Amino acid sequence: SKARVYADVNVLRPKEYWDYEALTVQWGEQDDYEVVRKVGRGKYSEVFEGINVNNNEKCIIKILKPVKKKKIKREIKILQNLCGGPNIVKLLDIVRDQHSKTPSLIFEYVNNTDFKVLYPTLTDYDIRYYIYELLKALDYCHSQGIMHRDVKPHNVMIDHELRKLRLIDWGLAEFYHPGKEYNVRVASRYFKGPELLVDLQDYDYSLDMWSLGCMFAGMIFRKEPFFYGHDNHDQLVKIAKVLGTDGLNVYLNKYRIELDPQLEALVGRHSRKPWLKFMNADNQHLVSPEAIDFLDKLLRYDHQERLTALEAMTHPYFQQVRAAE
Ligand SMILES: O=C(O)Cc1c2ccccc2n2c1[nH]c(=O)c1ccccc12
Numbered sequence: 001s002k003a004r005v006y007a008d009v010n011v012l013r014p015k016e017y018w019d020y021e022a023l024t025v026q027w028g029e030q031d032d033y034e035v036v037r038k039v040g041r042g043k044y045s046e047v048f049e050g051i052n053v054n055n056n057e058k059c060i061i062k063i064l065k066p067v068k069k070k071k072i073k074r075e076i077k078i079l080q081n082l083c084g085g086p087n088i089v090k091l092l093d094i095v096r097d098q099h100s101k102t103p104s105l106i107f108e109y110v111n112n113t114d115f116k117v118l119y120p121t122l123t124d125y126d127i128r129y130y131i132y133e134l135l136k137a138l139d140y141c142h143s144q145g146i147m148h149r150d151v152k153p154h155n156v157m158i159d160h161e162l163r164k165l166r167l168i169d170w171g172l173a174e175f176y177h178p179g180k181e182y183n184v185r186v187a188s189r190y191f192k193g194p195e196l197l198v199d200l201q202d203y204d205y206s207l208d209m210w211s212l213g214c215m216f217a218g219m220i221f222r223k224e225p226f227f228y229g230h231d232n233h234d235q236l237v238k239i240a241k242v243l244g245t246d247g248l249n250v251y252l253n254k255y256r257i258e259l260d261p262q263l264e265a266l267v268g269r270h271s272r273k274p275w276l277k278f279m280n281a282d283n284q285h286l287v288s289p290e291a292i293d294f295l296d297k298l299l300r301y302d303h304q305e306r307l308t309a310l311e312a313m314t315h316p317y318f319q320q321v322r323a324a325e
Helices: 069-082 116-121 124-143 206-220 234-242 246-254 261-267 289-296 311-314 316-324
Strands: 033-042 045-052 058-064 089-098 103-108 156-159 164-167
Touching: 033 058, 045 069, 069 089, 069 103, 124 156, 124 164, 124 206, 124 311, 124 316, 206 289, 206 311, 234 246, 234 261, 289 316, 311 316
Parallel strands: none
Antiparallel strands: 033 045, 045 058, 058 103, 089 103, 156 164
16 A cells, blocks of 8 residues: 555655654753743653743743654654644754753744633634644645654644644654555554554555544534544444444455454444434534535545545635635
8 A cells, every 4th residue: 555645755855854863963952941831741741831041932842751762853853844834833942951861842832722622612614724724734744755643633733812723743753655564553542543443554644634534523523532442442443333344344355454353343243324413403503514525535444545635625615714815
């Protein structure tokens, strides 16, 4: 399997572009940035709002927890390569604590309202607007030969007041190389694509489109997470109960994948549940025929079947967003 678009991006570019291991970090001054207040945390870092003591402007300080040098260089290289792109967070500096060598990534400031409180207030148009903005970021990184691999509300910072969006945390991102077999232990469970759940390793940019689809489904149906599995096996089960097992079998046979007998047993057999059956009094104001058609073209077992980010942006669902912009 290979990407249907942007497959040769890293083939045509200098090795220095994607060979992140060859990178030699040019450390700045740790003293230049002071922590003001904690704003977030994850299993790989702690994030704070900070201040640049030289110009006194706000910034974001991401202090990384102890991890391998290879992974830290990967995130830095990807951030440098994407800097300046549409709605991509901007890496400004890279510093480390002299004594313990704890690294911190410094970013342009971005305000945010946790999606749990923001999303319930988004109007029909707001959803079209923000998803379009996220798509700009995804088509951009994909066009630059990079898969984010961790698309989820938590990594989509939105300043609702300014209506500004930023795709953050590129710690799981990777460069796409045709034929490469990647680690399937990426993204967050509720947003993992079928390919990861069935161990199909030669995946591509399309993985992010499934995750986007999960996020989108959660938004229009007011059900977060849309696919609520407890462990990786259960995650595939929940997906199967919605898309149906018939399409799963077509997928598995096409890519010659054999499911673990245990997992196969858990999945069982299920008919497809139409998207319309997810509509209720709580989401009726957001479920339009265009939204459903768009969602349908994202949540497909077969990654090669999903809309690319570029195609997604042209879907009629976003017609007013385009006309306006
Ligand atoms: O790039 C990253 O890995 C994290 C990042 C990040 C990177 C750039 C700008 C803001 C960023 N933020 C975060 N993480 C947060 O939890 C957060 C919470 C509130 C407001 C902003 C946050």
